[PDB]
Structures are given as structure tokens and as C-alpha cells.
């Protein structure tokens, strides 16, 4: 019950996902691992402690030989120890962002936009698309992101599962996993996020709006044709509600990252561009790494 155009749209998105999503993290290598006072600054540190304590994970590294390295992070003793996983997380984030840039570059509708709009849309959506990809490796039974030979396992807090669900990012992963979406539904969610006309700096608002509407109509039609109706009557609206929530989490995450960066620099050069951090006029000149990655052959 899909139009030829709708089937071709899904084929292009699935091709882009297959080419650019390293689902086994086979090519994620050479990453860093954790090693083996004024009143205004005290206020900054206090907020950063809350920001960092929200997402507590242990790290497991499984060797090809069957050996296992497990890292349990330090307790907060009011020092630099709260930052021990930031270099690793910066390397993983950067790796995922490169895959999302490659994903967007494969899509004809994206390449056909002006380069400055390509930059604006990727700045707007990079975190969102990273979290949608991470949801596909999330084990809701074990609270673990299974990243090939790397695992990130949520640390238990005093309030158990009910305390974790208060953290919007964790609630998002649990709620999205429970929808049991198809590969096709995840890639259409990625397309709807990517082609958001209301991102800061977008010029071709009308063209992006029309592309977003066609991706949304394709998803709505996919659900009507491939899922037994009416058990899945409101699945499309649940997905759009999850995208609205992810946009809110995106805004909150950017603010957290900027607070941490301010007292403890950790962002990679690509992260500095995507999140608007200076190091040392036009969108292109302020995003030379993104510009280079978008101009390089997909």
C-alpha cells in the first residue's frame, strides 16, 4: 500500500543506514579509556556534579580471547574523578557523529540542500540521530548498551528502576525500546529528526518542511500497511511524541555539555563545531571540519 516513491524513499534511507551504521562497532578503535576556590566556581562545579551523576555506567571490554575488562567508575569524592569517562565518551560520541554525517551525505534529498543548510541540520540533529542509533543496541532487560565488544551498563541507584526513569534520557531509551520498532521505522525517525525545518540557521525552511512531511507520511503509511490495524492505530503518534521528547532531551544535553566543557574541557574538535564551542564569520568558516566531511566522497 506504499507508492513507488514511498518504497524508493525507504530503500534510500535503509541503504544509507546499512552503509554508515557500524552496528557491531567493529571499526571503533584507538579510543581513550579511564586511567589505571571562589563561590562562582563552587556554583559551576555543584551543577556539573548533578549533570555527570545523572548518567552513571560501568564499561565492559570483551577480548577476542574470551577475557573481560570491567571498569567501575569512582564515587563522587568532590574532585576531578567525576570526569574519568569523559575522554572515552568524547571518542565514542565523535565516532557516532561521523557515522551520522556519512548517513546524511548518502541521502539525495540532503546532498541537494545548500551546504550551509546541511551544516545547520547536522548541528541540530547529530545528538538525536546518535540516540536513535544507540536505542537499537539498548538491552532494556539488563539496562546495557551493547556496542559489539564494548558494553555500557547503568549503575544501580538507591531507588532502583523507578529512580532511573526520572532521568529523561533513560526514560526515553526504555519507552522507545518498548515500541518494538522495525529497522524501517528507526531510519524514518532519523529522517524526520534530520529534516527539521526549525533548527537554528536553516534558510530553505519551506523545502526542509516539505521533505519532513513526506518522510512523516511515508512512516504513517508504512505503519498502516505493515502493522495489524487497529492494535497499532496510534503507533505513528507515539513515534512523533518520542521525537518531540528527544528534541527536549537534545536541548538539555547541549546545556549539560557546555557547563562541563566550561570547567573541564573534553570535547573533540568535531564536537566543538557540532555544539558551538570555540578553540584557539559564515557558518562554513565556523564549521570547517563539518564542511570538509560533507565535501568528502561518501
XYZ file of C-alpha atoms in Angstrom:
298
model
C 0.000 0.000 0.000
C 3.077 2.295 -0.347
C 3.530 4.435 -3.501
C 6.608 3.638 -5.654
C 8.053 6.988 -4.364
C 7.479 5.891 -0.689
C 9.166 2.481 -1.311
C 12.131 4.229 -3.041
C 12.377 6.734 -0.097
C 12.587 3.829 2.420
C 15.078 1.949 0.139
C 17.391 5.036 0.050
C 17.207 5.508 3.888
C 17.853 1.754 4.548
C 20.797 1.833 2.045
C 22.201 4.919 3.884
C 21.775 3.159 7.313
C 23.389 -0.144 6.076
C 26.385 1.787 4.599
C 27.007 4.104 7.616
C 25.817 2.348 10.850
C 28.633 0.151 12.251
C 26.099 -1.928 14.304
C 28.907 -4.181 15.739
C 31.255 -1.160 16.402
C 33.957 -3.237 14.546
C 35.693 -0.006 13.331
C 35.575 1.802 16.734
C 39.295 1.503 17.720
C 42.121 3.620 19.308
C 39.689 5.176 21.877
C 40.829 6.546 25.271
C 39.987 4.590 28.480
C 39.891 5.762 32.126
C 43.427 5.681 33.662
C 44.731 2.661 35.677
C 38.166 28.044 45.169
C 35.770 31.029 44.504
C 31.961 30.990 45.235
C 31.049 31.424 41.487
C 33.236 28.372 40.516
C 31.791 26.357 43.502
C 28.297 27.003 41.958
C 29.565 25.796 38.500
C 31.117 22.557 39.981
C 27.917 21.811 42.043
C 25.686 21.939 38.880
C 28.277 19.841 36.877
C 28.230 17.167 39.690
C 24.409 16.809 39.167
C 24.879 16.796 35.320
C 27.519 13.948 35.477
C 25.909 11.812 38.297
C 22.670 11.556 36.169
C 24.248 9.020 33.665
C 26.383 6.524 35.692
C 27.619 3.494 33.639
C 30.201 0.726 34.100
C 32.245 -0.175 30.968
C 32.883 -3.815 29.879
C 35.502 -4.705 27.178
C 35.297 -8.359 25.950
C 38.546 -9.634 24.311
C 38.562 -11.880 21.178
C 40.405 -14.390 23.503
C 37.331 -14.521 25.874
C 38.993 -12.239 28.538
C 36.844 -9.408 30.105
C 37.996 -5.979 31.432
C 35.315 -4.291 33.619
C 35.554 -0.598 34.740
C 33.502 0.584 37.765
C 33.638 4.415 37.944
C 34.762 6.200 41.151
C 32.302 7.540 43.777
C 31.999 11.384 43.813
C 34.626 12.472 46.438
C 34.214 16.135 45.256
C 37.212 16.039 42.831
C 38.318 15.522 39.156
C 37.409 11.746 39.434
C 33.799 12.558 38.218
C 35.389 13.313 34.749
C 37.234 9.938 34.339
C 34.954 8.597 31.496
C 34.652 11.932 29.540
C 37.626 11.272 27.144
C 36.197 7.780 26.322
C 32.649 9.207 25.888
C 34.069 12.024 23.667
C 35.762 9.332 21.459
C 32.535 7.228 21.260
C 30.382 10.392 20.568
C 32.807 11.566 17.820
C 32.756 8.057 16.206
C 28.908 8.006 16.216
C 28.693 11.641 14.870
C 30.964 10.665 11.907
C 28.539 7.772 11.071
C 25.543 10.220 11.242
C 27.357 12.718 8.915
C 28.021 9.804 6.467
C 24.317 8.727 6.760
C 23.081 12.248 5.810
C 25.610 12.506 2.885
C 24.203 9.283 1.206
C 20.637 10.760 1.097
C 19.923 12.543 -2.266
C 17.385 14.940 -0.581
C 20.120 16.023 1.915
C 23.016 16.459 -0.631
C 20.658 18.625 -2.792
C 20.359 21.223 0.068
C 22.817 24.178 0.217
C 26.000 23.234 2.219
C 25.108 25.790 4.999
C 21.665 24.061 5.457
C 23.452 20.624 5.539
C 25.658 22.065 8.371
C 22.650 23.604 10.242
C 20.592 20.340 10.035
C 23.519 18.154 11.253
C 24.276 20.584 14.164
C 20.532 20.448 15.007
C 20.079 16.630 14.737
C 23.516 14.969 15.458
C 22.717 14.089 19.142
C 19.149 12.954 18.236
C 20.322 10.584 15.444
C 23.112 9.230 17.761
C 20.484 8.412 20.467
C 18.136 6.756 17.885
C 21.054 4.527 16.725
C 22.026 3.791 20.391
C 18.393 2.726 21.131
C 18.821 -0.146 18.598
C 21.720 -1.607 20.731
C 19.919 -0.933 24.081
C 19.013 -4.065 26.122
C 16.031 -2.915 28.277
C 16.214 -6.207 30.343
C 19.854 -5.523 31.505
C 19.977 -1.667 31.171
C 23.003 -2.141 28.843
C 24.046 -0.518 25.522
C 25.692 -3.485 23.701
C 28.327 -1.873 21.383
C 29.981 -5.008 19.920
C 32.838 -5.926 22.318
C 32.094 -2.732 24.391
C 29.123 -2.654 26.865
C 27.809 0.334 28.909
C 25.754 -0.886 31.902
C 23.637 1.507 34.051
C 24.905 1.527 37.707
C 22.170 0.805 40.346
C 20.975 3.828 42.444
C 19.135 3.587 45.846
C 15.643 3.985 44.217
C 16.209 1.187 41.615
C 14.431 1.247 38.176
C 11.886 3.947 39.338
C 14.762 6.427 40.137
C 16.440 5.748 36.698
C 13.107 6.502 34.852
C 13.178 10.065 36.367
C 16.257 10.747 34.122
C 14.640 11.861 30.805
C 17.368 10.250 28.587
C 16.957 6.831 30.344
C 13.109 7.016 30.266
C 13.424 7.831 26.504
C 15.502 4.638 25.820
C 13.110 2.421 27.851
C 9.939 3.926 26.237
C 11.318 3.809 22.652
C 12.561 0.177 23.076
C 9.046 -0.876 24.296
C 7.526 0.242 20.916
C 9.491 -2.676 19.247
C 10.079 -0.620 16.056
C 11.304 -2.115 12.743
C 14.654 -1.053 11.167
C 12.492 0.887 8.622
C 10.683 2.829 11.428
C 14.014 3.753 13.116
C 15.506 5.094 9.793
C 12.304 7.098 9.083
C 12.558 8.554 12.663
C 16.194 9.518 11.799
C 14.984 11.193 8.530
C 12.186 13.140 10.350
C 14.738 14.339 13.005
C 17.405 15.220 10.369
C 14.969 17.197 8.108
C 13.679 19.534 10.888
C 12.901 22.947 9.308
C 13.032 24.814 12.696
C 16.751 24.141 13.535
C 18.792 27.333 14.202
C 20.241 28.848 10.972
C 18.156 26.897 8.364
C 17.460 29.056 5.240
C 15.498 26.599 2.967
C 12.798 26.215 5.739
C 9.985 25.528 3.185
C 11.909 22.782 1.245
C 13.027 21.071 4.537
C 9.429 21.308 5.901
C 8.081 19.595 2.697
C 10.778 16.825 2.898
C 9.963 16.255 6.624
C 6.211 15.989 5.801
C 6.922 13.344 3.043
C 9.104 11.255 5.467
C 6.308 11.510 8.124
C 3.605 10.492 5.547
C 5.847 7.532 4.441
C 6.209 6.391 8.119
C 2.414 6.797 8.765
C 1.685 4.748 5.544
C 4.358 2.114 6.412
C 2.628 1.561 9.807
C -0.894 1.427 8.210
C 0.321 -1.195 5.596
C 2.748 -3.389 7.658
C 1.203 -3.460 11.164
C -2.068 -5.207 12.111
C -4.689 -2.406 12.436
C -6.028 -1.333 14.875
C -3.546 -2.631 17.580
C -1.065 -0.056 16.034
C -3.671 2.711 15.444
C -1.643 5.379 17.380
C 1.917 3.982 16.821
C 2.744 6.865 14.403
C 1.618 9.495 17.005
C 3.632 7.664 19.756
C 6.742 7.882 17.482
C 6.157 11.634 16.852
C 5.727 12.152 20.675
C 9.084 10.322 21.191
C 10.745 12.666 18.597
C 9.304 15.748 20.431
C 10.690 14.373 23.767
C 14.103 13.659 22.109
C 14.231 17.330 20.879
C 13.732 18.448 24.559
C 16.460 15.975 25.789
C 18.748 17.342 22.961
C 18.387 20.945 24.337
C 19.033 19.738 27.976
C 22.108 17.660 26.832
C 23.690 20.649 24.961
C 23.366 22.791 28.180
C 24.933 19.957 30.293
C 27.840 19.519 27.797
C 28.580 23.318 27.714
C 28.616 23.537 31.590
C 31.070 20.544 31.798
C 33.263 21.895 28.905
C 33.434 25.295 30.741
C 35.192 23.837 33.881
C 36.714 20.644 32.269
C 37.453 20.835 28.501
C 36.959 17.364 26.889
C 35.104 17.959 23.538
C 36.915 16.747 20.380
C 37.327 19.276 17.509
C 34.231 17.836 15.707
C 32.197 18.049 18.971
C 33.336 21.725 19.389
C 31.823 22.511 15.917
C 28.572 20.491 16.404
C 27.874 22.062 19.892
C 29.189 25.604 19.097
C 32.373 25.684 21.317
C 35.347 27.970 20.312
C 39.027 26.811 20.288
C 42.466 28.520 19.683
C 32.075 34.780 10.278
C 29.999 32.466 7.954
C 28.528 29.089 9.168
C 31.037 27.345 6.765
C 34.060 29.256 8.248
C 32.957 28.335 11.857
C 32.425 24.626 10.857
C 35.491 23.780 8.689
C 35.665 20.107 9.891
C 31.913 19.546 9.142
C 32.358 21.372 5.775
C 35.329 19.064 4.886
C 33.409 15.880 5.958
C 30.336 16.968 3.859
C 32.532 17.688 0.751
C 34.456 14.346 1.002
C 33.191 11.456 -1.220
C 30.543 9.337 0.637
